[PDB]
C-alpha cells in the first residue's frame, strides 16, 4: 500500500466517524469528539470525490445541526480543519462554525 505517516493517522478519523455515525443512527445526541470526527471525515471524503476546497468550506456547515449534538457542543467547535489529497494535490479545508 506504501502508507505514509499521515495516511495511517487519518484512517483513525474515518474509524471514529464510522463509530459516531452508528451512535447517531441509534438515536444518540453526539458529543464533541464524535461531531468533530463526522465533519472531518466528511471533508476528507469530499476531497477524494473531487469537490473543491470552496465547496467543502460551505458544505461542512450543513453536515450536523444543533439538534444532532449535546448541549454546548455547537459553541465548543469554533472551526474544523482538515487536509486531504484533492485532484490538484493536498489542500487545507477550514470550516468555520460548522454547527450553528
Amino acid at each position: 500500500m506504501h502508507l505514509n505517516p499521515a495516511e495511517k493517522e487519518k484512517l483513525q478519523i474515518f474509524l471514529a466517524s464510522e463509530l459516531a455515525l452508528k451512535r447517531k443512527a441509534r438515536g444518540l445526541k453526539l458529543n464533541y469528539p464524535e461531531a468533530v470526527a463526522i465533519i472531518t471525515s466528511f471533508i476528507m471524503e469530499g476531497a477524494r470525490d473531487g469537490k473543491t476546497v470552496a465547496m467543502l468550506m460551505e458544505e461542512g456547515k450543513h453536515v450536523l445541526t444543533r439538534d444532532d449534538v449535546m448541549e454546548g457542543v455547537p459553541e465548543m467547535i469554533d472551526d474544523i480543519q482538515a487536509e486531504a489529497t484533492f485532484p490538484d494535490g493536498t489542500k487545507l479545508v477550514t470550516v468555520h462554525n460548522p454547527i450553528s
Binding site: 505517516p5 458529543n31 470526527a37 454546548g72
Partner: protein, 570 residues
C-alpha cells in the same frame, strides 16, 4: 481610548472581576488581580508588541534580566491565588510572575522579565494555567501509564513497582536495593518527574534503611506485606532518621490490631494515610477517622471520587483483581466486601469539601485511574456546590474559595507531604517550571500543553504532515522535551538525602535532574494548604455512619457528572 470588557477578554484573556466557567461544570472562577499595565499587554505575532525595539528589548544579553520563555496573559489558578499575570521562565525554573516586556518603552515591567533576543513566547491569553499535578499514589505497572497521566495534567509520579509483578500490582513498592536501582535506571526514559517508594516492612532497621540509601524517596507500608505494629514502627523510625515520607495502607482485616493500635504504633509521628476512606484499603470500617488527626496527611484515591450511582457496583471485582484474591475463598470475598461502604464514600465527598481530606491521588492501575486525578477533583467540587451550595467563605458569586481548596489537593499538598514542595507543586517564583495550559472549555479534562522544566513535553496537536498544526486528528502527543537527551533536563528524579550524599546518581549513571526529598518529618495537617482541619471523626461500627461535630455526614449519589460524556469518545 476605552475597550469594552467583552472585547478586552477576547483579545487578552479576562481581567479583574471577570469570571470563567470551568469546563461544563457549574464552577466559576473570578480574576482577583491583574499584574498588567493596560495598553502595554504583551502579545506575539505579525505586527504585534513583542518585536525588537518595541516590546522586545534588543540590548540585553541573556544573563541581563532576560527570560528564556514568557507565557503571556495567563489566568493562574493556584493555592496562592486566582489572578492574571505573565509568567517568566529561565534555566527551567519560574523566575518571575508579573509583567513581561521591554523597560525601554513599557510601564510596569517586572525587572527580571525582559523579553529579549533569548526569549521564546507561549501565548496563554484565554488559557487557565496551573501547576503540574503531583500524584503520590502511583503503581508502576505499565509504561503506557505515563502519557495517560500527562494528558490530564500530571507532571510528578510518586509511588513504586517494577512492572506487572503481583507485588507491584497490589502495592506502591519497589523492594530492596537492586529493584530500586533498576527502576531508577528505567526512570531515565520516563518523560515525567518520579520518586520511588521502598517496602516499609521489616522488624530490623537495616533491611528497610538500605532501600533509602539505595535511592528510594520514601516508604510504603501495605497490608499485603504485613501492616503490623512492628513494620509501622520500624518504617517511621527509618523515616525520622532519613527525612522521607511514609505512606500507609493499614490492616483492613484488623488482624494484629484495630485503628487505635495502628495509631499507637505511629505514636504521633508524621504519616501519609493513603485512600483514607478505605475502599482502597485500611482498617474496616473506621480507617477514615485517621483524617481527623494532626500528625496525619490524608489523601483519597480516585475511583470513589465523587459518589455516583455506579460507584459501588464496579468495586468488588476491581478489588479482587488488585489484591490477588480468589472468588472461591469466602474470607477473601468477605475481606473485599468489608471495604465497600456507601456511608463512608458519601462522607468522603463532604470531608473533601470541608478541608478534612487534604489530597487527591490516582492509585494508578491498582484500584485507580492514572488520568483522572485532576478530572475527579473538579467533578467532586462541582457535586458539592450542587448539593451543599456555595461555601460560606465565597464572595461576588464566585467559587474561588472552593477552587483554591480543591486545586491544592493535587498540586501543593501532595508536594508538601512528600518533601518536594521546594521544587514542584505550585506556580511560584523559584520553583521548577512544570506548567499546564488548559482551554477553559477543556479545563481539568484534556490538557492543551504540558510544560516540563520550561520546555513543552506533551500537547494536544494535529496532523504532523499539515500546513499548520491545528488540522485533524488533534490528539495527545509527546513533544521535543521528551526526545533525545532533553528528557534528562526537563524531568526530576527525587531521591533521599543519603542516596544523594552517597553518590548513587553517579554510580548508576543517572543524567536526570536530581531532586532532594526534605522537610517531611516536621509537618502536619496544619501545613496542608486550604485543607488543614483537625476534628474527631466518629464512625459507627454497626451502621458505618460518619459524624463530625455531632452531625451525620451524608449526601446522595449522582446519576450524571460534568466532564464526562460531552468530552470522551469512549
Amino acid at each position: 481610548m476605552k475597550i469594552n470588557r467583552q472585547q478586552y477578554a477576547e483579545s487578552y484573556g479576562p481581567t479583574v472581576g471577570d469570571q470563567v466557567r470551568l469546563a461544563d461544570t457549574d464552577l466559576w472562577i473570578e480574576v482577583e488581580k491583574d499584574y498588567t499595565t493596560y495598553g502595554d499587554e504583551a502579545n506575539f505575532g505579525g505586527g504585534k508588541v513583542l518585536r525588537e525595539g518595541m516590546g522586545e528589548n534588543g540590548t540585553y544579553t541573556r544573563t541581563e534580566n532576560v527570560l528564556d520563555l514568557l507565557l503571556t496573559n495567563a489566568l493562574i489558578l493556584d493555592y496562592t491565588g486566582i489572578y492574571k499575570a505573565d509568567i517568566g521562565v529561565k534555566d527551567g525554573y519560574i523566575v518571575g510572575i508579573g509583567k513581561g516586556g521591554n523597560p525601554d518603552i513599557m510601564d510596569g515591567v517586572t525587572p527580571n522579565m525582559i523579553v529579549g533576543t533569548a526569549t521564546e513566547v507561549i501565548a496563554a491569553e484565554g488559557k487557565i494555567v496551573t501547576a503540574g499535578g503531583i500524584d503520590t499514589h502511583v503503581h508502576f505497572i505499565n509504561p503506557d501509564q505515563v502519557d495517560v497521566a500527562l494528558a490530564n495534567g500530571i507532571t510528578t509520579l510518586f509511588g513504586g513497582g517494577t512492572g506487572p509483578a503481583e507485588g507491584s500490582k497490589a502495592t506502591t513498592v519497589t523492594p530492596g536495593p537492586w529493584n530500586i536501582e533498576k527502576m531508577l535506571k528505567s526512570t531515565e526514559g520516563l518523560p515525567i518527574n518520579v520518586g520511588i517508594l521502598g517496602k516499609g516492612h521489616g522488624s530490623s532497621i537495616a533491611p528497610i534503611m538500605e532501600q533509602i540509601d539505595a535511592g528510594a524517596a520514601g516508604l510504603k507500608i501495605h497490608e499485603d506485606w504485613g501492616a503490623t505494629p512492628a513494620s509501622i514502627d520500624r518504617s517511621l523510625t527509618v523515616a525520622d532518621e532519613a527525612d522521607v515520607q511514609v505512606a500507609i495502607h493499614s490492616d483492613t482485616l484488623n488482624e494484629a490490631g484495630f485503628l487505635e493500635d495502628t495509631l499507637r504504633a505511629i505514636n504521633g509521628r508524621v504519616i501519609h494515610s493513603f485512600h483514607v476512606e478505605g475502599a482502597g484499603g485500611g482498617h474496616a470500617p473506621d480507617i477514615m477517622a485517621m483524617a481527623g488527626h494532626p500528625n496525619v496527611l490524608p489523601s483519597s484515591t480516585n475511583p470513589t471520587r465523587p459518589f455516583t450511582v455506579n460507584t459501588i457496583d464496579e468495586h468488588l471485582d476491581m478489588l479482587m483483581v488488585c489484591h490477588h484474591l480468589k472468588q472461591n475463598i469466602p474470607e477473601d470475598v468477605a475481606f473485599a466486601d468489608s471495604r465497600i461502604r456507601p456511608e463512608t464514600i458519601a462522607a468522603e465527598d463532604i470531608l473533601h469539601d470541608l478541608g478534612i481530606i487534604s489530597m487527591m491521588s490516582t492509585d494508578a492501575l491498582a484500584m485507580g485511574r492514572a488520568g483522572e486525578m485532576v478530572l475527579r477533583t473538579w467533578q467532586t467540587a462541582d457535586k458539592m456546590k450542587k448539593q451543599r451550595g456555595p461555601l460560606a467563605e465565597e464572595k461576588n458569586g464566585s467559587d474561588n474559595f472552593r477552587a483554591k481548596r480543591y486545586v491544592s489537593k493535587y498540586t501543593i499538598n501532595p508536594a508538601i507531604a512528600q518533601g518536594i514542595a521546594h521544587e514542584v507543586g505550585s506556580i511560584e517564583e523559584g520553583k521548577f517550571a512544570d506548567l499546564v495550559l488548559w482551554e477553559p472549555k477543556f479545563f481539568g479534562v484534556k490538557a492543551d500543553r504540558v510544560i516540563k522544566g520550561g520546555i513543552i513535553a506533551y500537547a494536544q496537536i494535529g496532523d504532523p504532515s499539515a500546513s499548520i498544526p491545528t488540522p485533524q486528528p488533534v490528539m495527545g502527543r509527546r513533544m521535543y522535551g521528551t526526545v533525545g537527551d532533553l528528557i534528562h533536563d526537563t524531568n526530576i528524579t527525587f531521591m533521599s538525602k543519603s542516596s544523594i550524599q552517597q553518590g548513587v546518581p553517579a554510580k548508576l549513571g543517572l543524567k536526570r535532574r536530581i531532586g532532594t526529598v526534605k522537610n517531611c518529618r516536621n509537618i502536619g495537617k496544619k501545613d496542608m494548604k486550604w485543607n488543614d482541619v483537625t476534628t474527631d471523626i466518629d464512625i459507627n461500627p454497626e451502621t458505618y455512619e460518619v459524624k463530625v461535630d455531632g452531625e451525620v455526614l451524608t449526601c446522595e449519589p449522582v446519576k450524571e457528572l460534568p466532564m464526562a460524556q460531552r468530552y470522551f469518545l469512549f
